[PDB]
Design a protein around this ligand. Structure first.
Ligand code: MG
Ligand code: MG
Ligand code: MG
Ligand code: MG
Ligand code: MG
Ligand code: MG
Ligand code: MG
Ligand code: MG
Ligand code: MG
Ligand code: MG
Ligand code: MG
Ligand code: MG
Ligand code: MG
Ligand code: MG
Ligand code: MG
Ligand code: MG
Ligand code: MG
Ligand code: MG
Ligand code: MG
Ligand code: MG
Ligand code: MG
Ligand code: MG
Ligand code: MG
Ligand code: MG
Ligand code: MG
Ligand code: MG
Ligand code: MG
Ligand code: MG
Ligand code: MG
Ligand code: MG
Ligand code: MG
Ligand code: MG
Ligand code: MG
Ligand code: MG
Ligand code: MG
Ligand code: MG
Ligand code: MG
Ligand code: MG
Ligand code: MG
Ligand code: MG
Ligand code: MG
Ligand code: MG
Ligand code: MG
Ligand code: MG
Ligand code: MG
Ligand code: MG
Ligand code: MG
Ligand code: MG
Ligand code: MG
Ligand code: MG
Ligand code: MG
Ligand code: MG
Ligand code: MG
Ligand code: MG
Ligand code: MG
Ligand code: MG
Ligand code: MG
Ligand code: MG
Ligand code: MG
Ligand code: MG
Ligand code: MG
Ligand code: MG
Ligand code: MG
Ligand code: MG
Ligand code: MG
Ligand code: MG
Ligand code: MG
Ligand code: MG
Ligand code: MG
Ligand code: MG
Ligand code: MG
Ligand code: MG
Ligand code: MG
Ligand code: MG
Ligand code: MG
Ligand code: MG
Ligand code: MG
Ligand code: MG
Ligand code: MG
Ligand code: MG
Ligand code: MG
Ligand code: MG
Ligand code: MG
Ligand code: MG
Ligand code: MG
Ligand code: MG
Ligand code: MG
Ligand code: MG
Ligand code: MG
Ligand code: MG
Ligand code: MG
Ligand code: MG
Ligand code: MG
Ligand code: MG
Ligand code: MG
Ligand code: MG
Ligand code: MG
Ligand code: MG
Ligand code: MG
Ligand code: MG
Ligand code: MG
Ligand code: MG
Ligand code: MG
Ligand code: MG
Ligand code: MG
Ligand code: MG
Ligand code: MG
Ligand code: MG
Ligand code: MG
Ligand code: MG
Ligand code: MG
Ligand code: MG
Ligand code: MG
Ligand code: MG
Ligand code: MG
Ligand code: MG
Ligand code: MG
Ligand code: MG
Ligand code: MG
Ligand code: MG
Ligand code: MG
Ligand code: MG
Ligand code: MG
Ligand code: MG
Ligand code: MG
Ligand code: MG
Ligand code: MG
Ligand code: MG
Ligand code: MG
Ligand code: MG
Ligand code: MG
Ligand code: MG
Ligand code: MG
Ligand code: MG
Ligand code: MG
Ligand code: MG
Ligand code: MG
Ligand code: MG
Ligand code: MG
Ligand code: MG
Ligand code: MG
Ligand code: MG
Ligand code: MG
Ligand code: MG
Ligand code: MG
Ligand code: MG
Ligand code: MG
Ligand code: MG
Ligand code: MG
Ligand code: MG
Ligand code: MG
Ligand code: MG
Ligand code: MG
Ligand code: MG
Ligand code: MG
Ligand code: MG
Ligand code: MG
Ligand code: MG
Ligand code: MG
Ligand code: MG
Ligand code: MG
Ligand code: MG
Ligand code: MG
Ligand code: MG
Ligand code: MG
Ligand code: MG
Ligand code: MG
Ligand code: MG
Ligand code: MG
Ligand code: MG
Ligand code: MG
Ligand code: MG
Ligand code: MG
Ligand code: MG
Ligand code: MG
Ligand code: MG
Ligand code: MG
Ligand code: MG
Ligand code: MG
Ligand code: MG
Ligand code: MG
Ligand code: MG
Ligand code: MG
Ligand code: MG
Ligand code: MG
Ligand code: MG
Ligand code: MG
Ligand code: MG
Ligand code: MG
Ligand code: MG
Ligand code: MG
Ligand code: MG
Ligand code: MG
Ligand code: MG
Ligand code: MG
Ligand code: MG
Ligand code: MG
Ligand code: MG
Ligand code: MG
Ligand code: MG
Ligand code: MG
Ligand code: MG
Ligand code: MG
Ligand code: MG
Ligand code: MG
Ligand code: MG
Ligand code: MG
Ligand code: MG
Ligand code: MG
Ligand code: MG
Ligand code: MG
Ligand code: MG
Ligand code: MG
Ligand code: MG
Ligand code: MG
Ligand code: MG
Ligand code: ZN
Lengths: 59, 154, 112, 140, 116, 101
RNA sequence: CGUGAGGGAAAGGUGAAAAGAACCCCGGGAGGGGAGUGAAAUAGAGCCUGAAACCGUGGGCUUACAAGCAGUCACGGCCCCGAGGGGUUGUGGCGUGCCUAUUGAAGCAUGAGCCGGCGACUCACGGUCGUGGGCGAGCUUAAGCCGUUGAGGCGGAGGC
RNA sequence: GUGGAGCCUGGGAGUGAGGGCGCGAGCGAUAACGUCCGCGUCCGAGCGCGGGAACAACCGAGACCGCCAGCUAAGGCCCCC
RNA sequence: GGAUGACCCCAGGCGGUAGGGGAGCGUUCCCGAUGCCGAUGAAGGCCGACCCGCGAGGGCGGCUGGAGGUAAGGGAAGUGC
């Protein structure tokens, strides 16, 4: 290969246009039906250790 | 660039470095290098014609004469060395210190007494020069300094 | 009333932590806490600490009520970079910049 | 003392019947009307001309042997994608495109010129659907 | 005595940068790109000060042409008829009358017909 | 009424009450000048061939000024040619008193 | 840095005074918020001033049918300050970067990422013209000597 | 014939790679955006302006500044214009 | 014209590379200055749609800054990227 190289410096406009796809999506969160805390769905509540109505995990 | 402290080594090869060519870091294109046409110790003196300085001397005194600012004095009655002594005299002679005065006299006691007044420049007549004449608004001279002046412009 | 915290010289690249700060700008203090707790970014840890600091400033020093607090403004500034050598092939040294961040959070009271 | 500039004009709808007219000599006039240069208040940087409806665009007329020798072409961007359609076949298939192509080639290029093209409504056959606008028939 | 640059260059650069406010990208932010853009801007303004005179005359003429044809004659004949009538209302005012005072413009059309 | 006058080598529709900048005329402020008339319009309608004999527009000179400064700049590439010229066009500001005719 | 001879940096400034911020709060710490000091604390030690490139936050105007050396001329829309002006730009007209080198460059020929700072026609002595003054068949001193301590004079050897 | 004419004395240069075109010749092949001279022109240095689709030297014409005024030049006047 | 730049009148010239010439701006330093501006705020910085100047530039006003600056007229250069 012959070492390809940027022909022109990217403008402030183009560099930031490229990053129009970089924003984070916020975490998907739902209230835990036992302790009302916000937690990811289909995961054991990290605050009261409950899942599927029963206690699974010590917290 | 020859009087600067660095060595005459060529900092990197002439060719094939991708960088500009350079010799030694004393060259004036380097920060910290020699300076190209900076000042060197110089003598600014020159021999102005004797007649020209003699003419200027007499003209500069004539100017004050034509203005009414040339005063000649017999002697300095009261003054014997003390600033307040000369001050008393200068008040009797219309020298209140509202105008600057070139005081030309061979009497050193008189010169010692006046030389600290901000409005007075002191000279012995052998030092009479045009710059100090034109510097000052008035010209006060001994008859003994008036005599020296006449002898020099002749 | 406004209350502010600033974490200065946090040793993390400004571009990375800004992604985290964009999540909570304009958010209520409680939503921001839950958002930061499950953000899979190193910078959630730093942004959380400044958010919690500022909310403690708002309650303890500025007569602001916790349950009214939202992120009225937040932003990341660049601190002085730590420059370090990265050896490369063929006797060449590169300079790696380990960038630093100033992290500002400003809280207000959403009267509702 | 500063040249007059009109406030946004209320456009006029005109109706032209193309039957028997010469293709280019009619396009030239539709171009004028779309540009609105027949209006004493003409302004080069606004759509303020007329709306022009045309019927019987399939009965346009042409001189010489242009029915067989006039070749519209389209290039698709692909190797060998230069398509050649004679005027005969175009009248046989998409007749309204004939007057449309000729009018468009006489409008200005750029944003405004593309908009004034949208103010042209070309139809084959005697009928047209713009009864709503009540177009004033024009003898051109 | 030594006379380093001091303030001189930063103040020259700022003059140019101020004049370049509004330009795109480094053309308003880099002294060098600003200066190159301003060289062009000055030349265009000179050339377009000349061109503005021609641009407006042509707009007057097209408008006068439309006002004339509403009376069954064309611009080139109107102008010759005004010449033979000795009327010297210019194209700026012809156009304006043509828009604001149709009745006066019509009078002027008659003079130009009568004077062929 | 309105009137087309000619001053400073240019033509202007004027009516009473109008303030107008024209090229610099030689008159002290506050005096009055008479402008030639090429056409009268409005109620009556008179057509100069080229100037209307009796007609006149009286205008008070409000005063004189210099236009806003224009940057006259010239540049030739690859030839180190640059010119910078500041231009302010003199003018007179007139108030139209009456159309006499 | 180099085996060695040898090469050879960068790096100055709180404030009048440490009065250099007790104590409380968040935080493991760093850091910050209050309190306090101070004439001043975006003088808080990463300290006078604090430009520019560069990065970010907020607001005004604007932008997803559009063809561009990026501007300019014109007109209209919005926003702002109060027969005017500023900011912005939708549309229309026009329009081939700078420098260098060349017969000829936008040129697909050279150089430049961008900003700030350093960076190139000088000095001595002679010469030659021109020029401002002094003297004029004459003009002029050199080294030194005396004086002065930013005073000037003497010195005629010599040179033209 | 009073012209950024001319002549004389002196100071300061830069240039000593030209190019295109018309005409006149040589060389070449009654070839070259070819080469070499002569007379002239323009570009060079007028890559400033109008025309010639675009285009240093073809046609028009020598840009001190301003004007939203008028007349013309080459070239144009069906639409883009 | 008035009378030796006192300003006015009318007229004509004013594209430009190498290059010749003329007039100015600004930077550092010296005389002016034992002066004068300055904490009621120096220099420097950041704005300005205002004033003067063809222009290089000079003013003025608001903010920053916190201790210097320096006229009319002249002199000298490490003088403008
Ligand atoms: Mg390969
Ligand atoms: Mg390979
Ligand atoms: Mg390989
Ligand atoms: Mg590679
Ligand atoms: Mg490149
Ligand atoms: Mg790139
Ligand atoms: Mg760039
Ligand atoms: Mg940008
Ligand atoms: Mg950005
Ligand atoms: Mg991109
Ligand atoms: Mg990406
Ligand atoms: Mg997101
Ligand atoms: Mg749930
Ligand atoms: Mg040496
Ligand atoms: Mg050495
Ligand atoms: Mg050494
Ligand atoms: Mg050596
Ligand atoms: Mg050496
Ligand atoms: Mg060596
Ligand atoms: Mg050696
Ligand atoms: Mg080298
Ligand atoms: Mg090499
Ligand atoms: Mg390289
Ligand atoms: Mg290099
Ligand atoms: Mg380099
Ligand atoms: Mg070197
Ligand atoms: Mg080095
Ligand atoms: Mg050296
Ligand atoms: Mg040094
Ligand atoms: Mg040297
Ligand atoms: Mg040297
Ligand atoms: Mg010196
Ligand atoms: Mg000398
Ligand atoms: Mg002698
Ligand atoms: Mg004294
Ligand atoms: Mg003393
Ligand atoms: Mg004194
Ligand atoms: Mg003294
Ligand atoms: Mg003394
Ligand atoms: Mg003494
Ligand atoms: Mg003494
Ligand atoms: Mg005096
Ligand atoms: Mg990340
Ligand atoms: Mg996540
Ligand atoms: Mg915390
Ligand atoms: Mg709390
Ligand atoms: Mg490696
Ligand atoms: Mg590696
Ligand atoms: Mg190795
Ligand atoms: Mg890098
Ligand atoms: Mg790096
Ligand atoms: Mg950093
Ligand atoms: Mg911050
Ligand atoms: Mg009008
Ligand atoms: Mg027809
Ligand atoms: Mg239209
Ligand atoms: Mg239109
Ligand atoms: Mg046919
Ligand atoms: Mg076009
Ligand atoms: Mg310098
Ligand atoms: Mg400096
Ligand atoms: Mg500077
Ligand atoms: Mg500055
Ligand atoms: Mg700018
Ligand atoms: Mg800007
Ligand atoms: Mg803009
Ligand atoms: Mg920009
Ligand atoms: Mg910038
Ligand atoms: Mg220019
Ligand atoms: Mg141009
Ligand atoms: Mg112009
Ligand atoms: Mg032009
Ligand atoms: Mg013209
Ligand atoms: Mg028309
Ligand atoms: Mg005519
Ligand atoms: Mg006319
Ligand atoms: Mg109307
Ligand atoms: Mg005017
Ligand atoms: Mg005028
Ligand atoms: Mg009259
Ligand atoms: Mg200009
Ligand atoms: Mg040019
Ligand atoms: Mg050029
Ligand atoms: Mg160029
Ligand atoms: Mg060019
Ligand atoms: Mg050049
Ligand atoms: Mg050239
Ligand atoms: Mg140039
Ligand atoms: Mg020049
Ligand atoms: Mg010039
Ligand atoms: Mg300029
Ligand atoms: Mg070692
Ligand atoms: Mg080695
Ligand atoms: Mg070692
Ligand atoms: Mg070595
Ligand atoms: Mg050092
Ligand atoms: Mg500092
Ligand atoms: Mg200090
Ligand atoms: Mg103090
Ligand atoms: Mg404690
Ligand atoms: Mg505590
Ligand atoms: Mg804790
Ligand atoms: Mg704690
Ligand atoms: Mg630990
Ligand atoms: Mg602490
Ligand atoms: Mg805090
Ligand atoms: Mg603290
Ligand atoms: Mg206090
Ligand atoms: Mg503080
Ligand atoms: Mg500050
Ligand atoms: Mg401070
Ligand atoms: Mg201080
Ligand atoms: Mg600071
Ligand atoms: Mg700072
Ligand atoms: Mg800053
Ligand atoms: Mg900044
Ligand atoms: Mg920010
Ligand atoms: Mg923004
Ligand atoms: Mg916004
Ligand atoms: Mg389309
Ligand atoms: Mg759109
Ligand atoms: Mg577009
Ligand atoms: Mg668009
Ligand atoms: Mg431009
Ligand atoms: Mg445009
Ligand atoms: Mg227009
Ligand atoms: Mg506006
Ligand atoms: Mg506008
Ligand atoms: Mg739009
Ligand atoms: Mg175009
Ligand atoms: Mg281009
Ligand atoms: Mg340039
Ligand atoms: Mg070359
Ligand atoms: Mg070559
Ligand atoms: Mg050349
Ligand atoms: Mg290339
Ligand atoms: Mg290129
Ligand atoms: Mg190459
Ligand atoms: Mg290139
Ligand atoms: Mg080469
Ligand atoms: Mg180069
Ligand atoms: Mg580089
Ligand atoms: Mg670099
Ligand atoms: Mg840049
Ligand atoms: Mg630079
Ligand atoms: Mg020399
Ligand atoms: Mg030297
Ligand atoms: Mg010298
Ligand atoms: Mg000499
Ligand atoms: Mg000599
Ligand atoms: Mg000499
Ligand atoms: Mg001499
Ligand atoms: Mg003499
Ligand atoms: Mg004599
Ligand atoms: Mg001549
Ligand atoms: Mg001559
Ligand atoms: Mg000659
Ligand atoms: Mg001769
Ligand atoms: Mg001669
Ligand atoms: Mg001679
Ligand atoms: Mg010379
Ligand atoms: Mg040569
Ligand atoms: Mg030779
Ligand atoms: Mg020739
Ligand atoms: Mg030849
Ligand atoms: Mg030859
Ligand atoms: Mg030839
Ligand atoms: Mg050619
Ligand atoms: Mg030929
Ligand atoms: Mg022929
Ligand atoms: Mg021959
Ligand atoms: Mg053959
Ligand atoms: Mg040839
Ligand atoms: Mg040939
Ligand atoms: Mg031949
Ligand atoms: Mg020739
Ligand atoms: Mg030419
Ligand atoms: Mg050209
Ligand atoms: Mg070209
Ligand atoms: Mg050229
Ligand atoms: Mg041409
Ligand atoms: Mg052309
Ligand atoms: Mg062609
Ligand atoms: Mg051409
Ligand atoms: Mg040409
Ligand atoms: Mg020609
Ligand atoms: Mg011909
Ligand atoms: Mg001329
Ligand atoms: Mg011309
Ligand atoms: Mg001329
Ligand atoms: Mg005509
Ligand atoms: Mg003709
Ligand atoms: Mg045609
Ligand atoms: Mg077209
Ligand atoms: Mg076209
Ligand atoms: Mg037409
Ligand atoms: Mg004149
Ligand atoms: Mg003349
Ligand atoms: Mg003149
Ligand atoms: Mg010239
Ligand atoms: Mg000094
Ligand atoms: Mg002093
Ligand atoms: Mg005071
Ligand atoms: Mg005070
Ligand atoms: Mg200073
Ligand atoms: Mg300042
Ligand atoms: Mg100028
Ligand atoms: Mg200024
Ligand atoms: Mg104030
Ligand atoms: Mg200040
Ligand atoms: Mg002090
Ligand atoms: Mg000074
Ligand atoms: Mg002075
Ligand atoms: Mg230098
Ligand atoms: Mg100088
Ligand atoms: Mg400069
Ligand atoms: Zn739970």
């Amino acid at each position: 290969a012959k070492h390809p190289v940027p022909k022109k410096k990217t403008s402030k406009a183009r560099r930031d246009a490229r990053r129009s796809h970089h924003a984070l999506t916020p975490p998907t969160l739902v209230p835990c039906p036992e302790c009302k805390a916000m937690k990811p769905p289909h995961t054991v509540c990290p605050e009261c250790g409950y899942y599927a109505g029963r206690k699974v995990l010590e917290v | 660039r020859g009087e600067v402290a660095y060595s005459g080594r060529k900092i990197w090869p002439q060719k094939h470095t991708g960088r500009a060519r350079h010799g030694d870091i004393g060259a004036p294109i380097f920060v910290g290098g020699g300076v190209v046409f900076g000042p060197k110790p110089r003598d600014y003196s020159y021999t102005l014609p004797k007649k020209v300085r003699k003419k200027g001397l007499a003209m500069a005194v004539a100017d004050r004469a034509r203005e009414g600012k040339l005063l000649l004095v017999e002697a300095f009655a009261g003054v014997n060395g003390k600033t307040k002594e000369f001050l008393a005299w200068a008040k009797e002679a219309g020298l209140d210190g509202s105008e600057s005065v070139l005081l030309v006299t061979g009497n050193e006691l008189v010169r010692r007494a006046a030389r600290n007044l901000p409005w007075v420049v002191t000279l012995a007549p052998e030092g009479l020069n045009v710059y100090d004449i034109v510097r000052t608004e008035r010209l006060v001279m001994d008859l003994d300094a008036w005599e020296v002046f006449q002898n020099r412009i002749g | 009333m406004e209350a502010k915290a600033i974490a200065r010289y946090v040793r993390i690249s400004p571009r990375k932590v800004r992604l985290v700060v964009d999540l909570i700008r304009g958010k209520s203090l409680e939503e921001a806490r839950n958002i930061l707790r499950y953000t899979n970014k190193r910078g959630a840890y730093f942004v959380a600490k400044v958010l919690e600091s500022a909310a403690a400033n708002a309650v303890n020093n500025h007569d602001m009520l916790e349950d009214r607090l939202y992120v009225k403004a937040a932003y990341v500034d660049e601190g002085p970079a730590l420059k370090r050598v990265l050896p490369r092939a063929r006797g060449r040294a590169d300079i790696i910049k380990k960038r630093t961040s100033h992290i500002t959070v400003i809280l207000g009271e959403k009267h509702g | 003392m500063k040249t007059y500039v009109p406030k946004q004009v209320e456009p006029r709808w005109v109706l032209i019947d193309a039957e028997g007219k010469t293709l280019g000599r009619l396009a030239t006039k539709i171009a004028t009307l779309l540009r609105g240069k027949h209006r004493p208040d003409w302004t080069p940087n606004v759509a303020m001309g007329d709306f022009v409806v045309v019927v019987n665009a399939d009965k346009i007329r042409v001189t010489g042997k242009k029915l067989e020798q006039k070749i519209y072409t389209r290039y698709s961007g692909y190797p060998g994608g230069l398509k050649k359609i004679p005027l005969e076949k175009m009248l046989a298939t998409h007749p309204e495109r004939v007057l449309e192509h000729a009018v468009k080639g006489m409008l200005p290029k750029g944003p405004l010129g593309r908009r004034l093209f949208k103010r042209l409504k070309v139809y084959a056959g005697p009928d047209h659907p713009h009864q709503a606008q009540r177009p004033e028939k024009l003898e051109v | 005595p030594r006379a380093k640059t001091g303030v001189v260059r930063r103040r020259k650069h700022k003059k140019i940068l101020k004049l370049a406010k509004g330009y795109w990208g480094l053309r308003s932010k880099s002294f060098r790109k600003a200066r190159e853009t301003l060289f062009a801007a000055g030349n265009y303004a000179y050339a377009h000060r000349k061109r503005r005179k021609r641009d407006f005359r042509r707009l007057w003429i097209v408008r006068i042409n439309a006002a004339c044809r509403q009376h069954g004659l064309n611009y080139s004949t109107f102008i010759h008829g005004l010449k033979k009538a000795g009327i010297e209302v210019d194209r700026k005012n012809l156009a304006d009358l043509a828009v604001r005072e149709p009745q006066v413009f019509a009078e002027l059309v008659e003079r130009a017909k009568a004077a062929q | 009424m309105f009137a087309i006058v000619k001053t400073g080598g240019k033509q202007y529709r004027v009516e009473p009450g109008l303030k107008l900048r024209v090229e610099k005329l030689d008159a002290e402020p506050g005096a009055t000048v008479e402008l030639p008339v090429l056409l009268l319009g409005g109620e009556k309608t008179v057509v100069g061939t080229p100037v209307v004999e009796g007609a006149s527009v009286v205008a008070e000179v409000l005063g004189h000024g210099r236009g806003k400064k224009i940057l006259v700049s010239k540049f030739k590439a690859k030839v180190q040619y640059r010119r910078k010229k500041g231009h302010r066009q003199p003018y007179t500001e007139l108030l139209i008193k009456e159309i006499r005719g």
